[PDB]
Amino acid sequence: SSKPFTLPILTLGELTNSRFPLPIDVLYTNPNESAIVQCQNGRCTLDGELQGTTQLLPTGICAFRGKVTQQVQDEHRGTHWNMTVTNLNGTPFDPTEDVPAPLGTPDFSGQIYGVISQRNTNNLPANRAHEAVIATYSPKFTPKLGNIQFSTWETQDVSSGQPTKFTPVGLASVDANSHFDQWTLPSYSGALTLNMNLAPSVAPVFPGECLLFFRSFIPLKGGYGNPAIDCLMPQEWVQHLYQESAPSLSDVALVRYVNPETGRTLFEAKLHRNGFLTVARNSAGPVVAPTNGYFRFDSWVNQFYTLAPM
Amino acid sequence: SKPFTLPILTLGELTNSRFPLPIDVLYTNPNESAIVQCQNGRCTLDGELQGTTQLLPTGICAFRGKVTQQVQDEHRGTHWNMTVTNLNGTPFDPTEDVPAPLGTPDFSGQIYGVISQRNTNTVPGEGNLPANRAHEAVIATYSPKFTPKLGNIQFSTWETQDVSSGQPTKFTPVGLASVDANSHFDQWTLPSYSGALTLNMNLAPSVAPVFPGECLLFFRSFIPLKGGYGNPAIDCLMPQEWVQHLYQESAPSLSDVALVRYVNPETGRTLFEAKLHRNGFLTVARNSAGPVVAPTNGYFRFDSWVNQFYTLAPM
Ligand SMILES: CC(=O)N[C@@H]1[C@@H](O[C@@H]2O[C@@H](C)[C@@H](O)[C@@H](O)[C@@H]2O)[C@H](O[C@@H]2O[C@H](CO)[C@H](O)[C@H](O)[C@H]2O[C@@H]2O[C@@H](C)[C@@H](O)[C@@H](O)[C@@H]2O)[C@@H](CO)O[C@H]1O
């Protein structure tokens, strides 16, 4: 009688990343990854429980809302601005809630590039927008405490006490001094303080298995690089699972990547209860798969199930 | 027949299908004089995408292509021509029965965003990696150089030189550059997709109330501005999550009009009712313009199929 588990019917070209507002470009593996994988956006259990900083809006991923309170010039170039942040729905962020940070807060170390825009509260309001960068590794990045900093090239035209939106676009840099690491969590309350209420880390537990990611290439403001952001599940999956809230019948679901044309299965994967995929693959890099393919739920299995090798 | 359904999403869990914005408020404007015929956020109740509608929230008002060259334009700023492909990177075939590449903007205005590039060619000394650049950009969709159905559009930058010819280019929309009279913002005026003096084709049809006392109901989002005075909004017929849901489900439509109730989960009560029409739009019995003041925690629930003779309870 339990509601059957399902995934949406969506090709890679119909999916978007749950960790940054980007389309999914390729499926991807990296077996030799030395880092602990514990991202906080795109986290949802198979029975529909959102975790980490995950919320449902594609427009909310790596977004901030708040007001500017302080202008501090950089030593050499640019200007820093303190921003008090609210929840994305505009209500005050309550730091006593059991979340790591306001929902949508970025979940990686780096310099995030985007646009800060403002519409004044006070017969038509005045507006302004400028390019902006948020350094999530900065000691001033303390979203769990209700405050962050962003920097601009613009030196003066940011207003205080006025509603402010950050729309993310890409990364500002991937140079050594910009500290881009997609698997390093920001310190949500500042450097000396432990992050709290985190979605759990994910890993394969069967020899020969590795994580399977939905990879998107992220725009760069300048420099050399081909940076990517890998998510455990696309945003449409998070949205689907939340809607469905189907009971999980074991800790591991078997899914098949199918070509609808031929009806052929290209490979199978384990979809784990906590909301991530593993496959039996001994290499790194993109999965080369037809454009019409998608994952279909097959059955519930267990941690001891042996995946057909890719 | 598979039962028709809507997703269970509060207003605060929905996004606009015509620009990448959250839904802020439900909205009516009974005395609107324009024909309402937007092309994004168009989907029948049985799951048929229409106009330039596609499924990705990242694809709405996005472009992908390659800059060809810097071009002269009499208007202020530095101007660049870019060819445009489909969003998936394949060549746009002007013989397909669509008005323009899916995701193309469906309104007249100066769309503000960011152009970014990642070069095709890589440098061995740079670890075999490509050079990149990004800058703010504006696309005037009313320009005679806005010809997405012909595979080319033009954008302007404040930046004067640092845009590279022949390199992969992405436009990420952010808001509008201006809503002054001279910036020709009109959310119900379609661009001329093939340029000045040409007829648009393959359009999703116009929408309108039929029953006396009814008006369209919109999902409204406020859109950021680069500068100037204004509080511009973009109104969609259905949010992007509804397009995505109807597409997935493709439930047969059992009449031309479905009855839906806007419900408060906490109270459990119906705040108002609306008609959800087969072509994918809502009407209500309301004789005022402005926001519908209700909890963002409320949502639409499918009640039953009705017909063109059914009278809505007044809001
Ligand atoms: C500092 C930062 O946040 N990112 C920098 C890049 O500098 C930023 O992006 C540039 C495109 C400019 O807008 C710059 O003002 C901005 O701070 C930096 O790019 C170079 O920046 C210098 C000036 O500092 C020049 O503008 C230079 O042209 C930029 O080079 C870019 O990348 C090249 C590889 C080429 O693709 C050029 O066409 C680009 O303009 C990069 C490289 O030093 O480093 C980031 O950290």
From TrEMBL, chain B:
Cytoplasm keyword on record: no
GO cellular component: host cell cytoplasm; virion component
Keyword terms of this UniProt record: Host cytoplasm, Virion
Calicivirus coat protein C-terminal domain: residues covered: 84-315
Locations listed in the record: Host cytoplasm; Virion
Superkingdom of source: Viruses
Protein name: Capsid protein
Species annotation: Norwalk virus (Norwalk calicivirus)
Residues of the full protein shown: 224 to 538 of 548
